[PDB]
C-alpha cells in the first residue's frame, strides 16, 4: 500500500501546482493513518511466532518485522504532519518550513526501501533495498539545493555511502564464493562450526553498521546531521538506524563477536565523551544518537534479543521525535534567527525558555530525563531490559562500560536543561498567534507516551509472550 501511494502520488504531484504541495502532504498523512487503523488486524496472522516467506523465500514476514513496519508508519505520520502543517501563520514560518514539490515522493520511496530491508530474506533483496534507501537519502539531503551546507553534505554522503555499499556487495559475493547460496537460512547451526564464516559475516555486519554511524567512522555522519536543515535531519537520523539495525538484529550473524564488542565499547566511549564540549544543538543531538546506536551494537552480540530491541527502538524513536519537535517549538522565542534552513543552531539560544512557555520546558525535561534513564519514564525500562540481556549472556565488562557511558552522556543531556531553566531579561507576556492545534497535540501525545507508558509494561510483556513465542 506504499506502492499504491507512490504510484498515485507522483501522478498527482506532476499535475498539482506548487501552491498545493502542503495540502498534498496532508492527504498522504491521513492516508497513512488509515493504513494503520484499518489494516493492522494482520497481527492475527502471526500467532505463536508463525513466520511466512513470500515471493519464493525472498521476503520474510514475522511479527518482529510487522512491529517494525508499524513503527516506521507511525513515525512517517509524525514527520509528514511536521511538513504538512503550518507552525504559525506568519510570513516568517512560510519562508522557513516550506516543503518542496518532490519531497513526499522521496519520503515514501525511502520508507519503501527501509521496509524492504527489515522484511528481507535474501541478499539481493537486501542489496536492492539498501541502494533504494541510500539514493533516497542522497536526494532528500540534496533537495534543498539553495544551501551550501546541504549541497556539501549530499556530496559527502554520496561518497561515504558508495564505499560502504561496495563493501556490502563485496561481502555478499564473498559469501557466495564459499557457499552457493544467498540465504542466511542456509546456515542452520552446523555449518558455522565447520566453516570459517567469521570474516565474511563480520565484514557484512561492519559494512552495514558504518552507515549507522558506529565509532571509527562517525564524524562524517555528524557533519551531515549538522549541515542538513532541521526538518530533513529528523528523518535521515532515524530511518537508516532503525531499518539497518532491525535487519542486523533479526539476522544473528555476529553473536559473541570480538570486533563488534570492540566497536561497541568504542562507540559508547566516543559518543559519551565526544559530545561534551559542544555548543551546537544538532551536534549535541547527534552524539546522543551515536551512544544510543552503541546500545544496539550491544544487542547484536546477543542471541534472542527481540524484547530489549523492540522496546528500546520505540523508546528511542518517541524520545528522538519529541526532542526534535521541542526545539522546533523553541524557534518562536529565540532573539536571533539565522540561516533560513536551520534557524536555531546554538544551544545557548534557548536560554530563557522557562519564562516563555514553561510547559515546553516541562516537555523538554521529561524527554531529557528519559534520555538519561530515570525510572518513572520510558527510557529507563529500555536501558533496564538491555542490561537484563547483557548480564544474562556474560558481557560483564560491556555492562560497566555501558554504565559509565550513560553517566558521561547524562552531562550533555542535562546541559539542555541547565540552559533552558535560567533567568532571561525580556520575557514574553502576550502573543497574538497560536501554535498549531494539530501539531502540538502530537508533541503532547509523545510526552504522555513517555511519562505514562510504564503503566502498560505487563500488558506488553504478555502480548509479547503470545506473539513471539
Amino acid at each position: 500500500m506504499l506502492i499504491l501511494a507512490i504510484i498515485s502520488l507522483i501522478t498527482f504531484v506532476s499535475m498539482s501546482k506548487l501552491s498545493d504541495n502542503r495540502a498534498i502532504i496532508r492527504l498522504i498523512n491521513i492516508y497513512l493513518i488509515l493504513v494503520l487503523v484499518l489494516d493492522s488486524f494482520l497481527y492475527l496472522l502471526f500467532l505463536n511466532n508463525q513466520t511466512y516467506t513470500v515471493m519464493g523465500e525472498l521476503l520474510i514476514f514475522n511479527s518482529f518485522t510487522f512491529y517494525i513496519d508499524m513503527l516506521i508508519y507511525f513515525i512517517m505520520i509524525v514527520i509528514s504532519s511536521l511538513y504538512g502543517y503550518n507552525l504559525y501563520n506568519n510570513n516568517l514560518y512560510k519562508t522557513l518550513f516550506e516543503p518542496k514539490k518532490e519531497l513526499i515522493i522521496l519520503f515514501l520511496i525511502n520508507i519503501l526501501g527501509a521496509l524492504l530491508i527489515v522484511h528481507s530474506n535474501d541478499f539481493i533483496t537486501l542489496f536492492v533495498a539498501i541502494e533504494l534507501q541510500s539514493y533516497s537519502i542522497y536526494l532528500i539531503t540534496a533537495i534543498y539545493n539553495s544551501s551550501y551546507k546541504a549541497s556539501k553534505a549530499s556530496m559527502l554522503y554520496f561518497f561515504m555511502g558508495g564505499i560502504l555499499s561496495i563493501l556490502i556487495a563485496y561481502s555478499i559475493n564473498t559469501y557466495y564464493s564459499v557457499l552457493n547460496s544467498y540465504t542466511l537460512h542456509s546456515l542452520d547451526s552446523l555449518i558455522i562450526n565447520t566453516l570459517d564464516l567469521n570474516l565474511i559475516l563480520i565484514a557484512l555486519s561492519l559494512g552495514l553498521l558504518f552507515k549507522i554511524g558506529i565509532a571509527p567512522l562517525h564524524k562524517w555522519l555528524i557533519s551531515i546531521y549538522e549541515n542538513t536543515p532541521i526538518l530533513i535531519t529528523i528523518y535521515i537520523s532515524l530511518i537508516p538506524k532503525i531499518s539497518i539495525l532491525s535487519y542486523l538484529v533479526l539476522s544473528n550473524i555476529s553473536i559473541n563477536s570480538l570486533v563488534i564488542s570492540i566497536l561497541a565499547i568504542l562507540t559508547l566511549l566516543v559518543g559519551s565523551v565526544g559530545g561534551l564540549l559542544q555548543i551546537k544543538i544538532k551536534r549535541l543531538l547527534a552524539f546522543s544518537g551515536l551512544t544510543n546506536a552503541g546500545y544496539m551494537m550491544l544487542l547484536l552480540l546477543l542471541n534472542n534479543n527481540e524484547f530489549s530491541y523492540l522496546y528500546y527502538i520505540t523508546q528511542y524513536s518517541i524520545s528522538h521525535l519529541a526532542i526534535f519537535m521541542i526545539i522546533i517549538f523553541s524557534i518562536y522565542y529565540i532573539n536571533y534567527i539565522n540561516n533560513q534552513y536551520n534557524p536555531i543552531i546554538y544551544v545557548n539560544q534557548l536560554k530563557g525558555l522557562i519564562h516563555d512557555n514553561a510547559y515546553l520546558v516541562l516537555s523538554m525535561a521529561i524527554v531529557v530525563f528519559s534520555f538519561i534513564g530515570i525510572p518513572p519514564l520510558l527510557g529507563f525500562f529500555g536501558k533496564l531490559n538491555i542490561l537484563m540481556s547483557i548480564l544474562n549472556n556474560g558481557y560483564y565488562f560491556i555492562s560497566i562500560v555501558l554504565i559509565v557511558a550513560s553517566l558521561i552522556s547524562a552531562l550533555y543531556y542535562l546541559y539542555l536543561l541547565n540552559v533552558s531553566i535560567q533567568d532571561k531579561n525580556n520575557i514574553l507576556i502576550n502573543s497574538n498567534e497560536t501554535v498549531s492545534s494539530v501539531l502540538s497535540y502530537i508533541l503532547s501525545s509523545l510526552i504522555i507516551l513517555i511519562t505514562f507508558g510504564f503503566i502498560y509494561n505487563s500488558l506488553i510483556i504478555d502480548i509479547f509472550n503470545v506473539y513471539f513465542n
Binding site: 551550501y148 558508495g162 563485496y170 559475493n173
Partner: protein, 89 residues
C-alpha cells in the same frame, strides 16, 4: 579472482588518496563496482549457475542509477559554486 580483487584494491586506494579532483573519485567508485562484477561472474562460471549472473545483472543497473543520481548531485553542488575545488568538496 585475481583481476577483480586487484582492480577493486587499486581502485579503492586511488579513491582514498585522491587529492587532485572530484571526478577521479567517481571513476574510482565505478571501477570498484567493475571489480566486484569480475569476481562474481567468475564465481558464477565456476559454480555452473546463473544466480551470481542474476546479482551481476542487477548490480549493473544499480551502478548506472547511482551514477545518474550522483552526477545530478554534483551538478547541484556546482549550481551555487561555479567552481569545483581541486582539494575536494
Amino acid at each position: 579472482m585475481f583481476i577483480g580483487t586487484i582492480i577493486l584494491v587499486l581502485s579503492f586506494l586511488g579513491f582514498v588518496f585522491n587529492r587532485r579532483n572530484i571526478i577521479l573519485a567517481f571513476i574510482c567508485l565505478e571501477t570498484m563496482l567493475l571489480g566486484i562484477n569480475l569476481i562474481l561472474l567468475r564465481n558464477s562460471v565456476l559454480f555452473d549457475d546463473i544466480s551470481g549472473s542474476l546479482f551481476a545483472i542487477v548490480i549493473i543497473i544499480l551502478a548506472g542509477v547511482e551514477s545518474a543520481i550522483g552526477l545530478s548531485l554534483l551538478v547541484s553542488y556546482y549550481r551555487l559554486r561555479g567552481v569545483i575545488n581541486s582539494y575536494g568538496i
